[PDB]
Design a binder for this molecule. Structure first.
Ligand SMILES: Nc1ncnc2c1ncn2[C@@H]1O[C@H](CSCC[C@H](N)C(=O)O)[C@@H](O)[C@H]1O
Ligand SMILES: Nc1ncnc2[nH]cnc12
Lengths: 233, 233
């Protein structure tokens, strides 16, 4: 049996998935929460990480360490940067880069940190399974580079800087690249499957308030089907 | 009765300290090596931190989670922000904050992340202990605020920002706050100590490779005295 680990940051991003877990058990390790059980017959371990890179890092580390899932899906909300994107649309990582790391003085690519690739690559089979679920579920989706940082992007210079440095980035958020970095170090396959809550302009906080519940529902639909698809056929 | 976790940025320090551990055992998890044993009769756990907040968090989490130390001592080198500091001063954190965290869109203080304090407070008796230890080595201990972030800040165009957003900040590097965050999450008292390698343009006498030779020796002795004085009571 495959065990699938699922990571979302916020209670609202995790609460629908957690309600669907059977035989559900809760583990606190300081003080992040991991819910274990079966989701549609598939062993899962669901982490609520909290917000940002170190919260994500510490939780992903405790998840891999304690529960030893075979695979990691990171779910939740994100700020759309691709032009097509509308609120509720799915984004799937083909890769993940930090938008706020810079050791370019020592020869690395912008966004790259030592001992890491410049971008972390999402596992191909997990990408293809997510795309299978997108098409089966008839969702609007875009596959691409997700960028992460300890900043909620809200227009102005913050946003401009990310579009200048990462013109191919499709979505921006605060945990995925930290999760991808942990999984590089543990050699565990990852994918991010998130939904758009805002478009990272100077209304993004208002949009996020308005549409976070839609982002959560849409990313939960994908994930709960993706765990079935991965764990069987 | 005590177990003391030691996390060092400077490789030569971690080396010298490892070589002093009795009944040493080594573990590898997630590409981190943790050494455990007795230093001068005290149960320790030892780890060299990686570069940036995720790598450091990961390392910290695995130390704290596997070895359950009573306290964290976190060592390294930093850049000086206060024009009043001298290359060779040792900063002892009273507080750590992120210089590159921005959730101000939702009203948080700059550098603050949701669910966290705006700064992570160093433990007062470990600060005091670290200070005595520094002064007894004939070294100059300066207490205050350390900021960290995943951009290397030497020069720039940049460094204000840092002083603009954090007057009060006296030192900057890339891991401290991340280690401070994890310790706060596990409720483990910490102290962050940092040898000052350069001060903002008091441009500069000894190369970093030469600074590090001396710093890593002074810091090694500092750590073995601090471990003893904390054990003693
Ligand atoms: C997505 O969406 C989340 C932003 S939440 C930032 C706002 C936060 N909930 C607050 O205190 O306001 C991150 O977890 C990101 O990765
Ligand atoms: N605009 C935004 N910036 C960063 N993380 C986000 N998650 C959702 N919307 C976001």
């Amino acid at each position: 049996s495959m065990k699938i680990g699922i990571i979302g940051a916020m209670e609202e991003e995790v609460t629908l998935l957690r309600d669907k877990i059977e035989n559900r058990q809760t583990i606190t390790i300081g003080g992040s929460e991991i819910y274990t059980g079966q989701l549609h017959g598939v062993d899962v371990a669901l982490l609520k990480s909290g917000i940002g890179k170190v919260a994500a890092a510490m939780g992903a580390t405790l998840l891999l360490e304690r529960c030893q899932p075979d695979v990691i899906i990171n779910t939740g909300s994100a700020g759309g940067l691709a032009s097509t994107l509308k609120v509720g649309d799915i984004v799937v990582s083909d890769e993940a880069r930090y938008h706020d790391a810079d050791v370019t003085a020592f020869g690395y690519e912008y966004g790259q940190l030592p001992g890491c690739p410049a971008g972390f690559k999402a596992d191909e089979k997990l990408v293809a399974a997510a795309e299978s679920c997108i098409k089966a579920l008839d969702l609007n989706a875009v596959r691409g580079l997700i960028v992460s940082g300890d900043a909620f992007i809200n227009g102005s210079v913050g946003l401009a800087k990310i579009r200048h440095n990462f013109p191919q980035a499709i979505a921006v958020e605060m945990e995925a690249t930290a999760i991808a970095h942990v999984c590089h170090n543990f050699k565990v396959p990852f994918v991010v499957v998130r939904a758009i809550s805002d478009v990272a302009d100077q209304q993004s906080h208002l949009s996020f308030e308005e549409f976070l519940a839609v982002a959560a529902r849409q990313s939960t639909l994908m994930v709960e089907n993706l765990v079935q698809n991965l764990a069987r056929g």
